[PDB]
Design a binder for these strands. Structure first.
Ligand SMILES: Nc1ncnc2c1ncn2[C@@H]1O[C@H](COP(=O)(O)OP(=O)(O)OP(=O)(O)O)[C@@H](O)[C@H]1O
Lengths: 96, 80, 96, 109, 444, 85, 97, 109, 96
DNA sequence: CCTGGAGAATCCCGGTGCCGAGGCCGCTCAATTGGTCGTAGACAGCTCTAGCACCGCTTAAACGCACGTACGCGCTGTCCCCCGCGTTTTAACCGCCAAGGGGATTACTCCCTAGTCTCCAGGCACGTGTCAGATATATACATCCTGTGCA
DNA sequence: ACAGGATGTATATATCTGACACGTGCCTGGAGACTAGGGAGTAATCCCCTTGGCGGTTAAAACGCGGGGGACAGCGCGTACGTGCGTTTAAGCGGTGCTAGAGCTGTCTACGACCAATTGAGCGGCCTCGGCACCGGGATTCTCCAGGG
């Protein structure tokens, strides 16, 4: 039975997702997360749909940029796999 | 509402990493990503709720979100 | 009818017809362009306001706008934008 | 009597509203007074920047075998020009995506 | 009103009538408690008078207490030699060296207090201000008094913070620029008197008020030696390349901030500049001489002086002019002597005397305008050549009378090369304004 | 003829000075190639700041760059400096 | 025979000394000449106040110190002790310059 | 006649210049109208922030045993405090130095 | 006689006496404190201006100042500052 | 150790529906035109401060050099952890409907803020003296490092 | 694994000085008291848009399994950097001389604010149609064994 090597499918998916332009998280779970986070600051809030869409867009962009910086860190450390320590170094040099 | 940070599934974090350009992901990455997402979202949502409270509304608007993001330094084009 | 909402949309469309005669735009792209125009206006006007305050003056003028353009735009864009603004002011002075 | 109203935009030969820019400057609380040439200068600058970005976006849209400019085309145009990238370095464009780049290490041997 | 003959305590003392009368004048000034200025220009000599004054204060009423002399580093061993020659009774101590040498010297000599006279320089004075202030000073002597001509200067403030019972200023040119610096000197002399800054309003009042506590004689009318000087200003028009260089600089990358300074040394040598020089130093040859008008003038004057004395002089105001002239001297197979701040002090100073010789057959002696000190026994010199004039006529006067020591028994000549339609004409105009002011305020 | 250029002013900042800067930063071992890179980075930073300050001075119609102009340029760049105005 | 410190103790004491101190580390005259040479590019015949050059020097010192801090963090991330030009470039890339 | 002039700072119990703050607000081009309580609120907030930083700096100066406050003490106070570090994150304090820290990997063992 | 300059030095010194009776400040530290007060004033006033423009109002009020404080300060500082400002306005409105 | 088939994956290409982009129309509000006024700012004149260029002297710093030693950097081996794939489960997605909350608008009223005048007291520039900080000097301590016995 | 020595460093004391805290005189902006007008508070009404339920479809996530590639530790080397020393250099402090240029005053004028009348430019609403999305089928391309080279 035909089987691909470990890394061909990853590169194909990289090309696919860097070509596409749609959101990569499930809308209902993200919406429930937003409502849960909003529960703390004020009780019984209401949201416009565009507000949740904009929040999801900003979250996706932030995570994509962070992962790119993490990949640069991991390549710097002579690796291919990213790690929590890579993410932490990226955040520290960004300014968090 | 509780236990909704787990709705951010591992396949979704993998897709975001693939768009970032990473090929191999460690097992401990996902909890870290959930944490960093929660921190970012909490900052933005707090600022948006402050704007909405000043407006004396009960609905959070796209303009409120855009204003909060502009304050953070992460201007967003498209929604206003 | 409802209230009115100002936009730079018609002017952006006219400029688009100037540059690419047989091309069109989508509503989301027009919203992005409107936001871009508002952002650039805000940056230039705020910089000019700070310049007027620093020089202990009370009028915003073409010199203030030019200095703000030089401060904000990088390199070639600054050069060409200054040229275009000077041309427009010359035409307005002549044809007034 | 009075002549036909000629817009200041047509007087300066601009496609952007000089009078509207003047009103936004007056009611924006930037300064107590606004000169006559400042709206003309600002409208010209805005026109040049818009024309630049729309030209790059139109070329990108043509390369994709399409005739409508979408946020993907806008993002490609912005991120493929260094000066416009520096201008919009902190800006996120909705439904834009990312540039295709893969670090050469990850490419298979 | 004092002894009319030489003191009995001075060895080899051949001081004349003017010197003995000046010593009497200083003695009387001490008696009446007024501190004065000894304004003898060069010839009468003031070091001898100061040494005799201190010897009087010692070998008379018992005040051998702490006394201070401030001299430049260029005259330190000269003053030590004079002290050991004329009056060896005093135990002078020389305070020079880095931190450790200063500490060793002060701890081993100064603190025990077996000394009588302390001789130091201005810089070492500022360095050791704090350790100096503790000693109560009975007599402070400041040579070259124009150093403290400016108030709110660090040396002036420090020297005023000293506790001195008596004071004495030594200067050969009391007036340099205006009356404010002279007022500063008078304020140091007597701070409680000339508290206020202020031909009938000026000149005469200053002369009358200076007469009680200032003395100045002239070498011509006192010595009857030192035959007069014939001064010639040769007007040299700059050649075509010099004119076009002057125009291209005046009308206009390269930094041109001080138009006056940049336009200046251009008439002297337009190739001191950086980046405007011709190609790399392929060789040393006829590039320096031909490309400067002053250079061609001096080069055509030189063979006459060679067929004649050939021991004349060189004077210029820029160290780069000095260096290029050194290179010219070596190229022309001539020999010179060098005096500048960069050259080691103690070893240059004795080198000067070493080079002082009855015969050298080397045809060149090069000096800078301000590098001139207080010694330099160049009695072999005959003419003074001024490449350019400085703002202060007093600096030029010091430069010209440095070679006018008494060792000089033949009349000395002053030669000036002047560039027309340049800044040299104003510089000369200011200089003559200042010199006329000084002459009317002092000599008249 | 004795005349030549002295040095280059970017070499005016020296290896020991860069080592002191790295010691304040918290560095122990320093590669030999770090110094050229640091000189380039410093040149870039100063170029940007001085460009903005010269623009401010030109607008004010002065020929002297002032500390206020430098502070305004730094605030534009997002590097606010306290202690000069 | 002469006393010699091992390679890394004098460096640590220098770290402590310069982290306790406060004065500026670059030399004033070289820095001022650099500033004037850079200003030549944008405009000729420029004057500088004394405070302007000092403010520039303060900003330059702060920027370089922070950059070296981030460089050290990168070098430790790669499990080295020495800093490298690649460490500097990674620091700048992540910071966004 | 007229009543004795009581300063608005005294009325509100502040040691900051409420009238100067009001004039700065009116001449700073922030709006068209300014409320009565806005300068009072702003002056009180400025007072609180100044008091906080001065207390921390004085504690640091006493730790180093100097009765005067210097920019080094100001920087030590601003750092070592998370809230003020967030506030002044992008601010350089002239001749204020750096926090003493050495990475544990460099420490000899 | 030199022109005058407006500084917060007197008030800073009063607050310093209040918080540490026998402690002093130097000239450079006073300049830094002056710059700090100016910067915080600029940030809060600009945020209030933008809030008023967002809500379409022409007057900056204590509500705008409170919201700007909440936006610009991080947490504990914001809470204590809000308490301080509310106390001050209450005392001002009490009899004046 | 290079070719050559298989086999997935991708691209190309024609056809079908749909819905948002582009045009057109009526209406109204914001921009234009014309005239008046009062202040910001342009311009000239004058003062004096601060910047520029240079020299002299001292000394801290920089520079060049030699020696050894940690340290960076390849190489190897182990093994564990992550990837690719098949299967089952779960929940998102989509369409539809109903109901109410709350955002948005309009008219009305009044209260707060801007604008003026008067005058007086806080705050600023200037001058001055004393004390806190800088510096030097000699203890006391702490820390590093190597060498010697005997673990 | 300790002793001892040799660096370096923190501490306690004595001197000196220049910057800070305070005082004084003066003046310009803030407070006290008034006016008028429009900006915001308040109430009421409308309607749209958010929430909530509900069922069916199907893609996506969770789960398990096997294997191979990459991380990580260990080892060896050979070189580039830290350390100390002797020599040179130019930075820092002090002086000089000069002048441009920043800063303040006085005067007048031309440019922007303001007001009223007018009109056409832009905005909401509406209809229609071609560009795009989707779909399926066939042609081209990349990857992975396996094998005889
Ligand atoms: N022993 C002496 N016999 C005669 N005259 C002497 C003697 N010593 C000095 N002089 C006089 O001093 C003059 C110059 O001598 P010297 O160079 O020693 O003076 P100086 O100390 O440099 O003078 P100053 O500084 O006062 O101008 C001589 O021309 C001469 O008149």
């Amino acid at each position: 039975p035909h089987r691909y090597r470990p890394g061909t499918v990853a590169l194909r998916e990289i090309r696919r997702y860097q070509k596409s332009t749609e959101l990569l998280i499930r809308k209902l779970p993200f919406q429930r997360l937003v409502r849960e986070i909003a529960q703390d600051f004020k009780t019984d809030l209401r949201f416009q749909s565009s507000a949740v869409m904009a929040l999801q867009e900003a979250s996706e962009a932030y995570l994509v940029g962070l992962f790119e910086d993490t990949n640069l860190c991991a390549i710097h450390a002579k690796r291919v796999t990213i790690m929590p320590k890579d993410i932490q170094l990226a955040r520290r040099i960004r300014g968090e | 509402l509780r236990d909704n940070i787990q709705g951010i599934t591992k396949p979704a974090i993998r897709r975001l990493a693939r768009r970032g350009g990473v090929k191999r992901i460690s097992g401990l990455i996902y909890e870290e990503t959930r944490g960093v997402l929660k921190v970012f979202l909490e900052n933005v949502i707090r600022d948006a709720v402050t704007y909405t409270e000043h407006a004396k509304r009960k609905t959070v608007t796209a303009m409120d979100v855009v204003y909060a993001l502009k304050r953070q330094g992460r201007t967003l084009y498209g929604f206003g | 009818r409802k209230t009115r909402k100002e936009s730079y949309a018609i002017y952006v469309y006219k400029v688009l017809k100037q540059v690419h005669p047989d091309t069109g735009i989508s509503s989301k792209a027009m919203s992005i362009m409107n936001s871009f125009v508002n952002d650039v206006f805000e940056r230039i006007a705020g910089e000019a306001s700070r310049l007027a305050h620093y020089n202990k003056r009370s009028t915003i003028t073409s010199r203030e706008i030019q200095t703000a353009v030089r401060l904000l735009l990088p390199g070639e864009l600054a050069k060409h934008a200054v040229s275009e603004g000077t041309k427009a002011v010359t035409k307005y002075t002549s044809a007034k | 009597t009075r002549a036909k109203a000629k817009t200041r935009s047509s007087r300066a030969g601009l496609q952007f509203p000089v009078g509207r820019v003047h009103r936004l400057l007056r009611k924006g609380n930037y300064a107590e007074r606004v000169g006559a040439g400042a709206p003309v200068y600002l409208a010209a600058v805005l026109e040049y920047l818009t024309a630049e970005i729309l030209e790059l976006a139109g070329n990108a849209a043509r390369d994709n075998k399409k005739t409508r400019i979408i946020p993907r085309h806008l993002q490609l145009a912005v991120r493929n020009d260094e000066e416009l990238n520096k201008l919009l370095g902190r800006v996120t464009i909705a439904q834009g995506g990312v540039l295709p780049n893969i670090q050469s290490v990850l490419l298979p041997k | 009103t004092r002894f009319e003959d030489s003191p009995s305590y001075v060895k080899w003392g051949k001081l004349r009538d003017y010197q003995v009368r000046g010593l009497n004048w200083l003695i009387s000034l001490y008696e009446n408690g007024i501190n004065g200025i000894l304004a003898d220009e060069m010839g009468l000599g003031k070091t001898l008078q100061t040494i005799s004054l201190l010897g009087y204060m010692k070998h008379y009423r018992n005040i051998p207490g702490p006394h201070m002399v401030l001299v430049p580093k260029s005259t330190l061993h000269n003053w030590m030699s004079e002290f050991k020659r004329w009056v060896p009774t005093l135990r002078s101590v020389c305070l020079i060296g880095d931190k450790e040498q200063r500490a060793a010297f002060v701890r081993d000599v100064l603190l025990p207090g077996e000394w009588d006279v302390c001789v130091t320089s201005y810089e070492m004075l500022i360095k050791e201000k704090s350790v100096f202030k503790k000693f109560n000073w009975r007599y402070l002597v400041i040579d070259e008094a124009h150093r403290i001509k400016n108030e709110k200067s660090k040396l002036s403030e420090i020297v005023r913070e000293f506790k001195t019972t008596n004071r004495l200023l030594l200067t050969g040119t009391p007036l340099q620029n205006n009356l404010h610096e002279l007022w500063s000197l008078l304020n140091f002399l007597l701070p409680d008197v000339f508290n206020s800054a202020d031909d009938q309003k000026l000149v005469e009042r200053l002369h009358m008020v200076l007469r009680p506590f200032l003395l100045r004689r002239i070498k011509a009318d006192v010595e009857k030696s030192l035959p007069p000087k014939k001064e010639v200003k040769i007007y040299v028009g700059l050649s075509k390349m010099q004119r076009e260089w002057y125009t291209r600089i005046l009308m206009k990358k390269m930094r041109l901030l001080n138009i006056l300074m940049q336009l200046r040394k251009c008439c002297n040598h337009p190739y001191l500049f950086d980046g405007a020089e011709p190609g790399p130093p392929y060789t040393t040859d006829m590039h320096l001489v031909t490309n400067s008008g002053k250079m061609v003038v001096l080069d055509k004057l030189l063979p006459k002086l060679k067929e004649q004395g050939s021991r004349v002089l060189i004077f210029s105001q820029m160290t780069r002019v000095l260096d290029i002239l050194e290179d010219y001297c070596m190229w022309r197979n001539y020999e010179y002597c060098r005096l500048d701040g960069q050259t080691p002090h103690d070893e240059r100073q004795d080198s000067i005397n070493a080079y002082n010789e009855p015969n050298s057959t080397k045809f060149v002696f090069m000096l800078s305008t301000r590098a001139g000190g207080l010694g330099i026994n160049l009695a072999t010199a005959d003419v003074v050549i001024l490449y350019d004039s400085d703002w202060n006529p007093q600096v030029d006067l010091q430069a010209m009378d440095r070679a006018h020591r008494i060792g000089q028994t033949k009349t000395v000549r002053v030669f000036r090369f002047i560039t027309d339609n340049t800044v040299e004409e104003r510089i000369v105009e200011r200089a003559e304004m200042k010199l006329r002011l000084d002459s009317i305020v002092i000599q008249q």
